[PDB]
């Protein structure tokens, strides 16, 4: 879902994007070298969305220029969050052209098992919804690509069907 038509003239560049948006670069190559990089920063989020459709899950939130967190330098960041079909677990992902790929997986309480059990919670109804996030480091994980890794993660959070 990212595709560019570039049109090179005599001292300008014209860029048309697959969703109705036109930009005009210049004869300096830093501009064009940063443009493509800022677009390679959004590909990952749209990749996770198009697979959250295919493989069953359901998206809860999507933004492709977020409005919180630190301040980026080349472009602007993107984030999503997407729920298990059984409903219990959830994934969330953030990416940026400068500081990218910060993924976190979120659990139902009574399976984090180091949680200070608050006092007002006495029932077992409130021990089925979900509160604790827990960050997972991207490195040292199976799958060569970023998209490929996601496949092995969003399949391991599924009921033990073996």
């Amino acid at each position: 879902s990212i595709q560019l038509q570039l049109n090179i003239g005599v001292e300008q560049i014209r860029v048309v994007h697959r969703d109705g948006r036109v930009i005009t670069l210049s004869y300096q190559e830093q501009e064009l070298q940063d443009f493509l990089l800022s677009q390679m920063s959004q590909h990952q989020v749209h990749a996770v969305q198009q697979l959250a459709k295919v493989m069953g899950w359901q998206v809860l939130s999507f933004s492709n220029h977020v409005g919180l967190g630190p301040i980026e330098s080349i472009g602007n960041a993107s984030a999503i969050t997407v729920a298990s079909p059984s409903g219990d677990y959830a994934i969330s992902v953030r990416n940026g052209p400068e500081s990218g790929s910060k993924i976190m997986v979120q659990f139902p309480r009574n399976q984090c098992k180091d949680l200070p059990k608050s006092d007002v919670l006495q029932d077992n109804k409130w021990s089925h919804l979900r509160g604790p996030f827990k960050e997972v480091q991207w490195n040292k994980m199976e799958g060569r690509n970023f998209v490929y890794k996601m496949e092995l993660l969003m399949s391991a959070l599924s009921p033990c069907l073996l």
């Binding site: 493989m55 069953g56 199976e142 496949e151 092995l152 399949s155 391991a156 599924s158 033990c160 069907l161 073996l162």
Partner: protein
């Protein structure tokens, strides 16, 4: 256990209204049959991915063998294609030299 059986069960149920011995009923029937078929297909997908992840993390040697096989095959693809370009290049070189 044997998800393939109910996979073809849903597949055959998708054709139930045709092989038998005014639009709302058929539309409802195809809606439920198709959604069930897609759900079973996605569950089979999930089982294969879980098994693949377990096997890959247990022993990467088979993954390495598959990588070797694909790299060799694509090597032959590149060699054959560059050979084809050279043959046609010689042909058109002589065609243009005949002038």
């Amino acid at each position: 256990s044997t998800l393939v059986d109910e996979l073809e069960s849903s597949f055959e149920a998708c054709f139930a209204s045709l092989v038998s011995q005014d639009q709302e009923e058929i539309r409802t029937g195809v809606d439920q049959c198709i959604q069930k078929f897609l759900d079973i297909a996605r569950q089979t997908e999930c089982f294969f991915l879980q098994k693949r992840l377990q096997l890959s993390v247990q022993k990467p040697e088979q993954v390495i063998k598959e990588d070797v096989s694909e790299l060799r095959n694509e090597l032959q693809r590149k060699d054959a294609l560059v050979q084809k370009h050279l043959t046609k290049l010689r042909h058109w070189q002589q065609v243009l030299e005949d002038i």
